[PDB]
Design an enzyme around this catalytic site. Sequence first.
Site, short mmCIF file in Angstrom:
data_model
loop_
_atom_site.label_atom_id
_atom_site.label_comp_id
_atom_site.label_asym_id
_atom_site.label_seq_id
_atom_site.Cartn_x
_atom_site.Cartn_y
_atom_site.Cartn_z
N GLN A 23 -2.06 7.20 -6.36
CA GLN A 23 -1.95 7.99 -5.15
C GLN A 23 -0.69 8.86 -5.08
O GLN A 23 -0.75 9.97 -4.58
CB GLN A 23 -1.96 7.03 -3.98
CG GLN A 23 -2.16 7.65 -2.65
CD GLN A 23 -2.47 6.58 -1.64
OE1 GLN A 23 -1.58 5.81 -1.25
NE2 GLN A 23 -3.73 6.48 -1.24
N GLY B 134 -9.00 1.04 -2.91
CA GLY B 134 -9.60 0.94 -4.25
C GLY B 134 -9.20 2.06 -5.20
O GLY B 134 -9.84 2.26 -6.23
N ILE B 135 -8.14 2.80 -4.88
CA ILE B 135 -7.74 3.98 -5.70
C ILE B 135 -6.25 3.99 -6.12
O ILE B 135 -5.95 4.28 -7.27
CB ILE B 135 -8.12 5.34 -5.03
CG1 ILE B 135 -7.48 5.47 -3.65
CG2 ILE B 135 -9.67 5.49 -4.95
CD1 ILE B 135 -7.58 6.87 -3.06
N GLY B 136 -5.34 3.65 -5.20
CA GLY B 136 -3.89 3.78 -5.47
C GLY B 136 -3.45 2.69 -6.44
O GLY B 136 -3.16 2.96 -7.60
N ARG B 137 -3.41 1.47 -5.95
CA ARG B 137 -2.96 0.33 -6.74
C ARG B 137 -3.92 -0.03 -7.87
O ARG B 137 -3.48 -0.40 -8.95
CB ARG B 137 -2.67 -0.86 -5.82
CG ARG B 137 -1.54 -0.49 -4.81
CD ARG B 137 -1.48 -1.42 -3.62
NE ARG B 137 -2.53 -1.15 -2.63
CZ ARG B 137 -2.67 -1.83 -1.50
NH1 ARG B 137 -1.84 -2.84 -1.25
NH2 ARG B 137 -3.65 -1.53 -0.63
N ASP C 66 0.81 -1.21 0.00
CA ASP C 66 0.00 0.00 0.00
C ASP C 66 0.86 1.27 0.00
O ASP C 66 1.85 1.36 0.72
CB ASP C 66 -0.93 -0.03 1.22
CG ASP C 66 -2.13 0.87 1.05
OD1 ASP C 66 -3.03 0.82 1.92
OD2 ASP C 66 -2.18 1.63 0.06
N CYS D 255 -8.16 -3.08 -4.31
CA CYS D 255 -7.10 -3.03 -3.32
C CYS D 255 -7.72 -2.28 -2.16
O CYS D 255 -8.84 -1.74 -2.29
CB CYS D 255 -5.89 -2.30 -3.88
SG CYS D 255 -6.26 -0.59 -4.29
N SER D 256 -7.01 -2.22 -1.03
CA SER D 256 -7.64 -1.81 0.22
C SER D 256 -8.59 -0.62 0.09
O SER D 256 -9.76 -0.74 0.41
CB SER D 256 -6.61 -1.63 1.34
OG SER D 256 -5.83 -0.48 1.13
#
Length: 293
Positions: free
Chosen positions: A271, A230-233, A193, A227-228
């Site tokens: 991100q 839902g935006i970065g990865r 993350d 992903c945790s």
Amino acid sequence: NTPREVTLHFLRTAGHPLTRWALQRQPPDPKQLEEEFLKIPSNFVSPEDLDIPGHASKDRYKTILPNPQSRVCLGRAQSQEDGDYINANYIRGYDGKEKVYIATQGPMPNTVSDFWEMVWQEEVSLIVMLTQLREGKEKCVHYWPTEEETYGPFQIRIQDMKECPEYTVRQLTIQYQEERRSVKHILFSAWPDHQTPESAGPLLRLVAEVEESPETAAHPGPIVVHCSAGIGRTGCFIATRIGCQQLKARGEVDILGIVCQLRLDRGGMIQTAEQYQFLHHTLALYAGQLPEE
């Protein structure tokens, strides 16, 4: 124009198309890429711009919310609770094609049924999960079974499972009423993350694994990527895929435009400046792997 209209104008008009040659041999420098990334509006929605009673209990982070114009709305398959809310958005793909992906947060125990309802209703045949497998307590619940589990009206069964380097492939069946469908699940385990993988190679092999996955529904549906938060990865993965597609089809890529289009679909996609830089690295590697041939 308003701040909102200024944001939307930037996201619709910004662009930096690079030829394959420029990407590989004379790329923007890291300072330039960072300045470019920092100019891109987040397009986050605030809790006040959502009028969806009861949504807060279904959000992992109260400040990371689905843009209403592209949110995935659940049907009426569950009788345990009301609401059409899931923290998930439809994401356009190559050339702005509609609903190529859904970007969603990691399901929490109370949204697992919602997640599978989405998978069912949207005729999803492929889930791409991005995480860093670490030892100990887990941030995000395992919403898939070891063998067989029921989630609300959905029975999920593992058909087969295999390990590749940096990802696991699960073949699942989902059952709703008298109906069964096959779903492929890819769990990519080397993406911490707020960071990047150590190397772009495994990520490109994941993209290849995605390309080679058959559609198995009656109609084509979105690829779910999560992903945790839902935006970065998710943003990094989808941008990588679309970038590879541009490079293969056109011998050029507009990474800035890709990221702007993702942000119109879901606030905050990609991100960090480091992730944006790593995206350029990953696409340069892809360009070097393209067939000669």
